[PDB]
Ligand SMILES: Nc1ncnc2c1ncn2[C@@H]1O[C@H](COP(=O)(O)OP(=O)(O)OP(=O)(O)O)[C@@H](O)[C@H]1O
Ligand SMILES: Nc1ncnc2c1ncn2[C@@H]1O[C@H](COP(=O)(O)OP(=O)(O)OP(=O)(O)O)[C@@H](O)[C@H]1O
Ligand SMILES: N[C@@H](CC(=O)O)C(=O)O
Ligand SMILES: [Mg+2]
Ligand SMILES: [Mg+2]
Ligand SMILES: [Mg+2]
Ligand SMILES: [Mg+2]
């Protein structure tokens with residue numbers, strides 16, 4: 110769209126919903142003793158987002174800072190681990206991400222700029238995090254019924270499926286979402302080096318919304334051991350050079366076991382207001398493959 | 404500081420205070436009916452920060468985008484969309500020189516940025532005073548220490564600061580209460596009427612310096628483009644914004660941005676802003692992490 114067209118849309122309802130969602134979610138975490146961090150947008154290191162069945166293997170945008178190449182944040186996952194290393198115990202951030210995805214990813218769920226509420230908990234296990242997310246989501250959906258006067262899935266806990274089993278039964282998480290009428294978990298997905306893997310099993314989880322809305326949250330237990338981390342990076346064809354300061358911290362033995370997740374704020378707003386395309390809930394759309402005018 | 408030294412610092416108390424500050428400030432705006440917007444980091448347009456350095460840039464699908472200097476122009480566009488009252492916790496990227504490493508500058512930071520349709524300068528100042536007074540009282544509970552009391556702050560004209568103290572920084576070092584500086588000639592978006600600028604900076608005492616800037620805004624296309632031309636800026640670096648102004652869609656408003664890290668610094672009483680950041684971003688020193 111062009112500038113004047115963009116500012117001509119009526120998105121007041123979506124923004125009012127977003128405000129209520131942000132109020133609810135931030136209070137959820139501060140009420141439970143989480144510390145609230147500010148984001149970083151530029152770093153020598155960022156989330157590789159690869160390997161990942163959910164991706165095409167994009168490289169992060171980058172810019173020079175005092176002559177040094179910095180990467181724009183793909184996600185703050187490595188920084189969350191470092192925050193745990195600093196003894197903050199339980200942390201969250203409203204983190205903007207920049208992911209220059211292709212036109213193939215303009216499916217109504219993707220934006221090339223977006224924010225996730227990203228959180229991490231020292232010593233947590235996958236079951237603990239999934240239980241916390243269920244509590245947050247159940248509580249939010251009850252609130253959403255008051256806000257909108259419409260009904261939302263009533264489930265207090267969600268069914269759990271192995272990634273491999275999803276592939277076999279539905280073919281893809283896409284079709285699975287299409288068939289379900291309640292949120293559900295997909296677990297054990299081989300992906301990035303930082304998700305914990307133990308004897309062929311991945312200790313990770315994606316929360317999928319029903320009715321074709323697709324993934325809304327993703328997380329895992331983490332790796333913390335240097336030699337294990339380096340082997341995974343190498344096996345994936347990635348370069349140790351891209352993670353140098355982080356691997357220095359790992360080699361020193363300063364990473365601690367932890368688990369966490371990120372929740373897409375815009376994807377959640379979209380679900381609650383029932384928008385067909387995520388661009389409808391953004392004052393300034395960032396459609397994959399289409400450079401925005403404003 | 405290498406990577407290991409950076410993460411070996413003690414920062415728990417500062418983050419603890421920051422959490423309480425963020426909880427207080429976001430609740431302050433939601434309580435008063437403000438909409439909570441999410442930030443943008445890449446756009447063809449951004450705050451020039453001049454008259455008062457060039458924006459970092461990156462190509463996005465073949466188009467040159469600017470990293471956010473500030474969301475000022477986007478705030479005005481949200482007013483134009485009819486959102487009425489808005490705020491955002493907005494990260495900024497400002498690649499300042501090594502000279503700006505003065506203890507209150509970082510090349511990445513967040514401001515709580517807000518805007519209100521139809522508001523006048525004294526409306527926004529009163530609102531900021533209410534916020535700060537309330538925060539200072541809560542901080543006495545959190546920290547067991549005493550903070551500035553003033554319910555309302557002294558107002559200095561910009562010229563009177565220059566003549567009596569030389570700069571806002573020297574003024575800061577000699578006050579014990581927050582104070583306002585008004586009528587400062589700067590960027591094209593602040594409203595200027597009869598040689599008077601309808602704008603304001605909130606300055607902290609004890610040498611901590613500026614914590615907020617804001618103003619009523621220009622909304623008329625002709626008035627806007629004159630100030631841009633006069634300043635020596637390129638109209639074509641603001642095209643889609645000027646399209647909207649020319650279309651007659653900009654509305655009168657006022658607002659301000661408040662430096663979150665600068666506030667945390669004041670309340671914990673840290674000598675350098677880097678002490679309250681988990682990952683320091685010191686001007687002229689590319690971060691190691
Ligand atoms: N391009 C995007 N646009 C909007 N929201 C997103 C986008 N990418 C991720 N998110 C949201 O934030 C979370 C990000 O974590 P993560 O990087 O692991 O997601 P993802 O694997 O890349 O998602 P997807 O495969 O659907 O593109 C997601 O669960 C989702 O809710
Ligand atoms: N480099 C920075 N580091 C940390 N906080 C900043 C920085 N620049 C601005 N801020 C904070 O956010 C606000 C941003 O608005 P503004 O553009 O008007 O600041 P500024 O005029 O450029 O600040 P200053 O004169 O100290 O350099 C400031 O009032 C301040 O609190
Ligand atoms: N946030 C300021 C602008 C800035 O200082 O970046 C304002 O609202 O005027
Ligand atoms: Mg995914
Ligand atoms: Mg993806
Ligand atoms: Mg994911
Ligand atoms: Mg400045």
Ligand SMILES: [Mg+2]
Pocket residue numbers: 613616
């Ligand atoms: Mg200033």
Ligand SMILES: [Mg+2]
Pocket residue numbers: 604613615616
């Ligand atoms: Mg200023």
